[model samples]
Target: PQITLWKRPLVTIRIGGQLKEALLDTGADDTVIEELNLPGCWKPKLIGGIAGFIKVRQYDQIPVEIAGHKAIGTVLVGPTPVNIIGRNLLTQIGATLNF
Candidate 1:
């Protein structure tokens, strides 16, 4: 089934057993969440954004469920204004954009 994109393309997903609403940002290369409260280890990395360069913790192999499909990949945690599901995970979910 084809799901049309919303104005913001926001979607509710599950990560590490926590329900999180995230924006489907094609512009982003990796998924980014605002909160970081997990058992896994993280590495410090700086990412450039609309505001400026900001520091984030990169966590790998985080389990994420999108549209009932499951995948494991990297997730960046920081003070992001909004939760975002980027191209990396989106591609794994077989998401395609028209127009």
Candidate 2:
């Protein structure tokens, strides 16, 4: 679907058989999700944002379903305001921004 830039690009995503809404953020370098119980080992990571940087758990090779598009990549878990699907997963999903 063609999305308008005026509003946020929110889409349904499936992870671990659970459905949740996430933001399609082209500006972000990595995918970040709000605190969720993900199975696997994760390492401590520090990510920078507009406000500042925060510590997040980095989990690799996680399977995620974005708007029906299946992708496997690294997912970061932390105290984010919203779930963001960044360039890493966006590229796998073949997402592009157009005017």
Candidate 3:
């Protein structure tokens, strides 16, 4: 689907057999998700945002589907303003933002 920047580019995605709402953020380099209990091993890592940096768990090889597109990559789990599907996954889904 073609999306315009006039509004937030939020979309429903499937992860771990669960449905979730996430933003297709082109400005973000890494994908970030709200803290949740996922059946996998993750490493503690810190990421910085506009305000400050926060500690998060980094999980790799996670399967995620966005707008019917399937992708497997890294996903960070921690406290965040919103669920963001960043460039990491965006590239997998062949998403591009243009004016």
Candidate 4:
């Protein structure tokens, strides 16, 4: 479906049995989430952002639901002002920019 962008296109997503609003960053190549009590093993890694690179824990095959669409893939947990849903998962949901 088509998606409209504004100040910061954001959407509510469910992950790890918790629902939270996250940024829908089409410019982003991968999904990133705010650090929370998430389970499973995570590998240390650094990610590039507008503010620069940040250390994060990358979790594999994390399940997420966005706009009623289900997606399971890599999820990075770290210290971000807000959660971000990147193009990797967005494309899987058949979302498109309707600018």
Per-prediction TM-score: 0.90, 0.95, 0.95, 0.90
> Which numbered prediction scores highest in lDDT against the true structure?
2
User: Residues 1-99, candidate 4, lDDT per residue (tens digit)?
Assistant: 455554777789999999999998878888989977789999998999566899999999999999789999989999899899998898888887653
Writing each residue's lDDT as its tens digit, candidate 2 over 25-89 gives 99999999998999899999999978899999999999999988999999999998889999999
lDDT for residue 26 in candidate 3, whole number 0-100: 86
Candidate 1: which stretches are off by over 4 Å? 1-6
* Model 3 worst lDDT run, 10 consecutive residues: 31-40
Over 54-77, each residue of candidate 3 has an lDDT whose tens digit, in order, gives 999999999999999999999999
CA shift of 23, model 1, Å: 0.1
Candidate 3 matches the true fold with a TM-score of 0.95
Q: Model 3, which residues run further than 4 Å from truth?
A: none
Model 2 has a clash total of 0
Writing each residue's lDDT as its tens digit, candidate 1 over 8-46 gives 777788987899888988899999998868568899999
For candidate 2, give the lDDT of residue 76: 96
